[PDB]
UniProtKB/Swiss-Prot annotation, chain A:
The keyword rRNA processing does not apply. Transcriptional activator of elastase structural gene (LasB). Binds to the PAI autoinducer. This is Transcriptional activator protein LasR. The lineage of its organism: Bacteria, Pseudomonadati, Pseudomonadota, Gammaproteobacteria, Pseudomonadales. The chain holds residues 6 to 168 of 239 of the full protein. The keyword DNA-binding applies. It comes from the Bacteria.
Amino acid sequence: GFLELERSSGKLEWSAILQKMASDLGFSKILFGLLPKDSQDYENAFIVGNYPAAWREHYDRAGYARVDPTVSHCTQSVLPIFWEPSIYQTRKQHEFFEEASAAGLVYGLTMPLHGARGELGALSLSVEAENRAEANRFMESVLPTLWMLKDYALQSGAGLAFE
Amino acid sequence: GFLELERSSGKLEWSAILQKMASDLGFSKILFGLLPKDSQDYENAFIVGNYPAAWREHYDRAGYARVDPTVSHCTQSVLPIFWEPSIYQTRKQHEFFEEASAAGLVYGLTMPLHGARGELGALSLSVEAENRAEANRFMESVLPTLWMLKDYALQSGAGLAFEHP
Ligand SMILES: CCCCCCCC(=O)Oc1c(Br)cc(Br)cc1CNC(=O)c1ccccc1[N+](=O)[O-]
Ligand SMILES: CCCCCCCC(=O)Oc1c(Br)cc(Br)cc1CNC(=O)c1ccccc1[N+](=O)[O-]
């Protein structure tokens, strides 16, 4: 399933299944973020996951939506962006990397979300890996599954979030 | 192998690469169709693949874009729709399925495409098989690789269709 996310009964069970799927696949931290079509800000955002509260708060308070290189990437692509040194170009972006790392989120990837009704978002997952080599090996072995996952999460989440 | 789609220059080589990748996954016929954001007709569509010419012409002339259940599905979902007379209901819909079958396009699936810039389209692929059960086994066996392929085709195809000189 393949169906279990769509066949979840409400936000709570959806969130838990999503987090559990991620957990089973090997990702201890996930965040699904979705905005309605042509959103001006994040006032109508549907954001669900198990990222630490302190980090969620820090990201909001620091305005990191405007710094985070995965955000801009999502506006330009349907392909995943892996969390690697090359995506952090400016000192501001390097600072974001360091703060995310301090919060425990070092290795991972962000999958852009583009819904059939203009929904815009991202599914981010972090793996608690020993090092970059181990992180990449793990991520390669799960990537095709995660690629299907992001679209199922999008289709179901959008239905749950905006109708 | 996905890197080859960006590496290519021109509609011809790109389409050839995509067709080969699809063939390697067990699909002998494919159609990649993509419209720019908020298109009101198909005049500005980018449509490439190896569906037979006669079928392409008939589908257009008969107005099957308004009948084909995979088309309406693509406007509503990011998930694939498998080709099944179950997705047919109306008179024209069984006409459509009958004519598609006659053209040799019986089993397959359509993967909706929703681009970062509002591009809307579909990657449709047909699989040759002895029966639907076998067709389903062939398709399920490659679904994760196809899922990646459709997004790689979308990202590279949108550039080729609408952006690159
Ligand atoms: C405009 C497009 C719609 C994007 C809609 C929001 C998508 C989203 O969830 O962005 C967030 C938000 Br809101 C809060 C946090 Br905290 C994190 C993100 C996404 N970024 C990452 O997950 C990320 C990415 C790289 C490195 C570290 C991290 N991280 O947070 O630990
Ligand atoms: C508005 C969003 C759409 C986006 C528009 C692009 C989708 C597309 O390419 O539709 C077509 C077109 Br144009 C011509 C033909 Br011929 C076929 C399709 C899509 N349908 C199938 O491939 C299909 C589907 C089911 C059964 C048989 C077939 N078939 O043609 O053999």
